[PDB]
């Protein structure tokens, strides 16, 4: 105190190394969006479970070849056929209907001509097959798509709609997944009012709590609103104890610089007995960013004490907090996606690695997107974080059009 300046790269790997993976629970498959499977999932049935027509047409004997055929009836979707197709006969079929016994190929309706139908016009009676069917033509054999006993999803799979649909397909409606982190957010400062309050002398509204909670909720994680806590050790300790009790992760903002009434670091170390892994980061913005762990009865709580400056708080939440939460919910590689974009504007480099919210836009047919710093464009929310390199003797400035790293923080 003052804590050493931690490199940005050391701070980041420290968060990922020291963050735990949460335990597992069984969920309903319909709740599986963004969850990570903690089990392999196996088909207990064949898909298709019967030989299925690929086409609307006729089930035939390929050995009959082309010619004129009696239609003995129809194989209807959802019904096992009871007839056997004999030589010179066929049965109508629709897409996904079972192939009746006696038939070994399907001929699509376009390769046929109807000869005779019922007086009512509701029943086909005789058809001309115009082609020589290949054996097994336009049939999905049993287990063509999925075999009984096949592993259809591996443990470690990060599920979206198509994985949910596969769980439905194989009838595995209950699955083991990692828990989502529960994340408690508090604001600190005697100067802060609720968003709902009219201003009073010397005061401003608390924006960080709203911004950070919304940032966590955007990624699908449950949250706990711990309110505004005054600049005093006892109150801060009480709020932190409530967060540890109710949540896996505690986010504070404010009170981490070396100011007179910046108390969070003292409380985390002396009162709470947490391990502070870093208390300053060589980065812009976010110098005072603080990361702590607290082990209670073989459970690791994680604490991010972010800076009070609203821009710092949201930038550091995106860099440190979101990857940690991804790790806790079981994502094997929790690192953010980093893309290449073109700077929309000349920018001066700082001795510190520098980060700024931006909007990524793809122009007509140019391969790389443009990054426009947020500091009609105002109709869209930030979807990137510009990652600017530390200045060097070589480079003191980057020019409009230069290719830069941008971390994805938004979902178009």
């Amino acid at each position: 105190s003052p804590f050493p300046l931690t490199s940005m790269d050391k701070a980041f790997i420290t968060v990922l190394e020291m963050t735990p993976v949460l335990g597992t629970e069984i969920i309903n498959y319909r709740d599986g969006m963004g969850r990570v499977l903690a089990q392999d999932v196996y088909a207990k049935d064949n898909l298709p479970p019967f030989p299925a027509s690929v086409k609307d047409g006729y089930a035939v004997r390929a050995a009959d070849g082309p010619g004129d055929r009696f239609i003995i009836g129809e194989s209807q979707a959802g019904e096992q056929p009871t007839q056997t197709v004999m030589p010179g006969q066929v049965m109508r079929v629709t897409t996904g209907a079972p192939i009746p016994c006696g038939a070994d190929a399907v001929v699509q309706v376009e390769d046929t001509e109807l000869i005779r139908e019922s007086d009512d016009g509701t029943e086909e009676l005789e058809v001309r097959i115009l082609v020589q069917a290949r054996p097994g033509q336009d049939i999905r054999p049993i287990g063509h798509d999925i075999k009984r006993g096949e592993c259809v999803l591996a443990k470690g799979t990060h599920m979206g709609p198509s994985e949910i649909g596969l769980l439905a397909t194989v009838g595995v409606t209950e699955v083991e997944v990692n828990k989502f982190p529960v994340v408690a957010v508090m604001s600190t400062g005697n100067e802060l009012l609720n968003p709902e309050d009219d201003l009073l002398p010397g005061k401003i509204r608390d924006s960080n709590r709203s911004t950070l909670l919304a940032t966590i909720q955007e990624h699908g994680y449950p949250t706990i609103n711990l309110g505004i806590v005054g600049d005093n050790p006892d109150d801060l300790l009480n709020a932190l104890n409530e967060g540890i009790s109710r949540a896996d992760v505690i986010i504070t903002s404010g009170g981490v610089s070396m100011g007179e009434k910046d108390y969070l670091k003292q409380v985390l170390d002396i009162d709470l007995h947490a391990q502070i892994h870093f208390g300053r980061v060589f980065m812009k913005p976010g110098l005072p960013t603080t990361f702590a762990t607290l082990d209670i009865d073989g459970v690791r709580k994680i604490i991010f004490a972010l800076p009070g400056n609203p821009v710092s708080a949201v930038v550091t939440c995106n860099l440190f907090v979101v990857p940690a939460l991804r790790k806790m919910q079981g994502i094997l590689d929790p690192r953010p996606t980093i893309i290449k974009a073109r700077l929309s504007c000349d920018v001066k480099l700082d001795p510190r690695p520098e980060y700024h919210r931006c909007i990524l836009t793809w122009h007509h047919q140019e391969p790389l997107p443009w990054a426009q710093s947020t500091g009609l464009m105002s109709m869209r929310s930030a979807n990137g974080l510009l990652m600017l390199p530390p200045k060097t003797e070589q480079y003191v400035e980057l020019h409009k059009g230069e290719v830069v790293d941008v971390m994805v923080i938004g979902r178009l």
Binding site: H363, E366, K400, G401
Partner: peptide, 11 residues
Amino acid sequence: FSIVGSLPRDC
């Protein structure tokens, strides 16, 4: 065709 050097097209 121009004998005068152009500027980078998209920038």
